[PDB]
Please model this.
Amino acid sequence: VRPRLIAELARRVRALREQLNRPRDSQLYAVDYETLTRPFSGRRLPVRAWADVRRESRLLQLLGRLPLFGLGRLVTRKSWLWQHDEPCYWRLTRVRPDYTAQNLDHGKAWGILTFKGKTESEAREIEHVMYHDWRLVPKHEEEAFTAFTPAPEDSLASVPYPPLLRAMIIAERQKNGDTSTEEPMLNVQRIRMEPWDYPAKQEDKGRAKGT
Amino acid sequence: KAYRGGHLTIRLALGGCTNRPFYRIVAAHNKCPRDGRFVEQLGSYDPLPNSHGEKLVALNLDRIRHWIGCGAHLSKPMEKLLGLAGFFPLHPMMITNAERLRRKRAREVLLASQK
Amino acid sequence: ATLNQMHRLGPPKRPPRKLGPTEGRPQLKGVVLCTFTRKPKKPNSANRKCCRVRLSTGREAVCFIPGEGHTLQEHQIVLVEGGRTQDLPGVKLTVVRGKYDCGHVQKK
Amino acid sequence: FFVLMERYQHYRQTVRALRMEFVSEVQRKVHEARAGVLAERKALKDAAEHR
Amino acid sequence: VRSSVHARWIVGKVIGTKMQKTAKVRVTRLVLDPYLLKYFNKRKTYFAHDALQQCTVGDIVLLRALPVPRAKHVKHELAEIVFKVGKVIDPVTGKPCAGTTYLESPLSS
RNA sequence: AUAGGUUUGGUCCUAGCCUUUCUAUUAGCUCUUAGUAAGAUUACACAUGCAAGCAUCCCCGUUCCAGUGAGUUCACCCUCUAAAUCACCACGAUCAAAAGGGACAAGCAUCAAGCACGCAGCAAUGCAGCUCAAAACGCUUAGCCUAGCCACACCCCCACGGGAAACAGCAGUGAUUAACCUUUAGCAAUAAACGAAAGUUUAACUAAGCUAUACUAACCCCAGGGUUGGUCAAUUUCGUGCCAGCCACCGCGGUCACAC
Ligand SMILES: [K+]
Ligand SMILES: [K+]
Ligand SMILES: [K+]
Ligand SMILES: [K+]
Ligand SMILES: [K+]
Ligand SMILES: [K+]
Ligand SMILES: [Mg+2]
Ligand SMILES: [Mg+2]
Ligand SMILES: [Mg+2]
Ligand SMILES: [Mg+2]
Ligand SMILES: [Mg+2]
Ligand SMILES: [Mg+2]
Ligand SMILES: [Mg+2]
Ligand SMILES: [Mg+2]
Ligand SMILES: [Mg+2]
Ligand SMILES: [Mg+2]
Ligand SMILES: [Mg+2]
Ligand SMILES: [Mg+2]
Ligand SMILES: [Mg+2]
Ligand SMILES: [Mg+2]
Ligand SMILES: [Mg+2]
Model:
């Protein structure tokens, strides 16, 4: 095979140039509030976000006004406050500000999540840090804000099989000599339907490429 | 052939002729063409009523279960078909569309009564 | 030949078919350069109406004009098909009547 | 909207349970094909016949 | 699962011994002629590792696939010498023979 | 091939060419209806309009589908093992890259030698070896083994870079060729992308338009084309006179020509 070395050189050069010309958060996640478009790409934001973009604050717009960038403070979100009655918040543990921003209002954060009053065991990266959806819990309100009594979370333990599948199961049992009259049942105790708005793993999320 | 990402899905491949559709239930890579390469044919579906006024659906239930257990996804029309067969629960959209049709026909009957 | 020799030589290898004056094409377009007449080889005697044409491929070739009476002149466009003129040696192309400038034979 | 959301949650729960059961059946069939008792008996019988 | 080499067990004649610890072996298979429907011999050359350099030109040897190729062309090892050239021992009777004649009679033992 | 015509003064043999059969493209002449299938000659150049969005901002997709056949043994089997789907707690299944082994188009040997193409050693280094008339090395031809697959995405194999400004997406156009479809509609179905979802988008697709290229069925009045010496079904009168002309092969035409 005749080697393709120019392809090797091109891939290596492009990798180096992408690693050295990384667009920063201050560039990627800036917004023109008059037209609600991203200057970096020119793509307009979805309609349903417009009002929030003009009313709410990004997470580090709050953190940059605090000592140590607000480590140990509690931060919640407007969407969580509207959607859920139980407390939802992040307890910050690590913050990496974007020094290139003029107001230090862009960057990354990590913390412990409590969703609907259930706290997690480990600290992980926070997603949607650049969203205009963030609010800071006052220190004199935290005791009232974090208060939560875990209600009995008793849901269905099992459900009926679909009609045809139930009939097939019963027919198989009867063919194999079993004469049991117990209904076939699907266990759903191991299926926990997590709410669609629960934070995902920001570590697995991608990043916009520089263009 | 190697596709970037992708997954197996059980779906309907359209065959037949103009004004006469027919569907082959096939498990295929989601990136493949609709009527192109497939992994296995898992059944068929004739959407036109026959001389007996019936829509004939053939389902290879054993292989359907096998491919679902192998990680294959399902297209929405297949979820509706399997719900109709009783293999799955009725899809929520069938129930919602039935309720919408009920409300629309109730509105029509109310119009008739008003007239 | 023995079976061993047949296995060694393998299946017969047929030479590729020879391309004719049309080079494997049904017809060819051409421009008439000059019109003239040629005499048959002699079991026969006549004055066969012929014309030299530059084909679309660039090659110059002699063609026969069938029918009684033709009005072909220089620089005119004609369509030529295959089929040898049995009487004329070296004339393997025939002008198509009723196409481009070459019109149909006048009645009677 | 609310009724549809609840219906989707329940339907997806049921479908996920069915999918896990199908996956378990597939894995069980693979295990019974490779290291199943009948397969092992057949292998031993074939070896004895060969000997 | 035990080897990445296609040919696992093969029998051939040693045709070369000029490489160090490597025997060049000729293996013949029967291939059907599609037209004549007769089986003809097809030859292939294999390089077999011979650590002790005990192979001689003309002897019939058995080659076993290596777990992985030890070289570009060496994918096999010498399992045994089926027939030593000019030193054949009759497998049926276990006695030395020269062609179709017994060098030592079976009855003698 | 159930074969047939044609070499000779004549017979037999050998041998070529052609005829009879079935397809596809184009050309001449002719052409009524309905349904269905199929549909630039050109890897030449392209005006114009569309062909990728979705979504509470992040991401995801635009790496797919669709197109072409320039190049061309990257496609298939086994081993190993990435990425992806589902288990997602992994045990592992499914799917499938890179790497290793095997297999794999046609013509030319007036392409007969290739010129480092091997092996052993932890390495240092040593041996001089390896392929090939059972076709190496080389030139030329071609997309293929079609539920589909391979290759390419203007060119320099590749694309950091350069030439330069790209329809081999749909519709359409110029040139070119014997070769010539509408600058329609809709996302109602299926498929794909996105979303938790109601849903949104899509020249994929669906439903239409044009065309005897093909198949099927008709038709109230409506038939054309070719042929008529033998092979091979079928000529009456005249005209012409080796001229005009005709033939797939054998051949006809010189005043009674079934051959113009
Ligand atoms: K004559
Ligand atoms: K998205
Ligand atoms: K090609
Ligand atoms: K190329
Ligand atoms: K649609
Ligand atoms: K006469
Ligand atoms: Mg003959
Ligand atoms: Mg004669
Ligand atoms: Mg025609
Ligand atoms: Mg993996
Ligand atoms: Mg591979
Ligand atoms: Mg020779
Ligand atoms: Mg020569
Ligand atoms: Mg080509
Ligand atoms: Mg182009
Ligand atoms: Mg290129
Ligand atoms: Mg086009
Ligand atoms: Mg055409
Ligand atoms: Mg449109
Ligand atoms: Mg159409
Ligand atoms: Mg006549």
User: Anything to note?
Assistant: Residues 8, 13, 15-16, 22, 25-29, 40, 43-48, 56, 66-69, 79, 81, 83, 86-87, 96-99, 104 of chain C lie near RNA strand F (CB under 10 Å from a C1').
